[PDB]
Amino acid sequence: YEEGPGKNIPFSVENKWRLLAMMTLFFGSGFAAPFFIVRHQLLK
Amino acid sequence: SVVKSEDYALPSYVDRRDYPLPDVAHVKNLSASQKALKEKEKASWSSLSIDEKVELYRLKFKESFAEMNRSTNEWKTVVGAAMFFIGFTALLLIWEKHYVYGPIPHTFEEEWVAKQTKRMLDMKVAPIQGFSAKWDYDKNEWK
């Protein structure tokens, strides 16, 4: 297995813009979820 | 002096006021002139020039106490930036008020509040300290 900075993680940091997209999707999905659950409950 | 990742397990150089004499010299490799200066250091220090004494200090150490201990302007950036982001937060609250928050209940209308205030004074809400205590029932005005 790869050792050292940027290699001991399950996500790539080879490209900072690809990483920004991945982090955006990751943290953004968690933050969005409750808003969409509330919407779902209100639409029943 | 170039510090390398692969030297992690070896004694290293630090500037710390609580560790004045670190484990290694700042500069280990010596030029011809620097070797001659370290030989000169074995004789009377009275014979060293001011420049030679400074050069010997700067081989042993990176920064002086005065340099390592200096104050910075970082506090201005931190406080200014914090106030900027707190300011940005008020934009989110303006957006929420405009697009999310509908009209408040009718019980906050000026006339409702005036009538509710009189009814609270008529039932003597908090007459010892909190509310009615602040009304002058003799003069019909706030104390």
């Binding site: - | 609580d18 209940p105 009718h106 019980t107 006339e111 409702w112 009538k115 509710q116 009189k118 009814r119 609270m120 039932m123 003597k124 809400v125 908090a126 007459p127 010892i128 300290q129 909190g130 509310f131 205590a133």
Partner: protein
Amino acid sequence: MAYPMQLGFQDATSPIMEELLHFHDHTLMIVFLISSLVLYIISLMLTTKLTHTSTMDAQEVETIWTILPAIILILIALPSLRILYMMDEINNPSLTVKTMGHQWYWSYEYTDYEDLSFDSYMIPTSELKPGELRLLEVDNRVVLPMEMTIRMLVSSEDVLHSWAVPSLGLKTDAIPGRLNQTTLMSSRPGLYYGQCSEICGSNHSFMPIVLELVPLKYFEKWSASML
């Protein structure tokens, strides 16, 4: 009831609530002093270039750190437990009233003499009369005699509720299959408000309590008129 920008407790309407205000004053002075001392000591530890980084002996100072807090806790516990046992003292009530929690309203039963019972529901916001309080008024108030020891018994016919009147120092959980007792004594006539204080579903926010405290003669005539 609470008023805008209120910082502390509702003014006391019962002697026990008075006792609780003075006990809170005593406790809060201690909370302020300890908070302030910790903040000050932090600021003192952080404002000197002088250093001392060698091993420091702990046992002498730990005596102070344990004994002084132990004394402070005793100085809180003594008046705390005096009040706890004062509320538990035998009193001899003149009247027993029952309240039953429901989803989402209170019923009241005054059955010492006659079968008097009724339901008490929040006045909807759209039906408030000018000067009335949003979410606090009810259609049928809990009329009670002032300056008299009343036994309140509290239960539920469905889920948990809790019957609270902050200005009298009251909060008694409403548990199905259980009859919980508290005592109520108002020093004053008037209207005293509270709100359901255990999560009970869709209209937990909307099942308030309004006591109406009047002279015994008025209470007797109201009682007769409600049969």
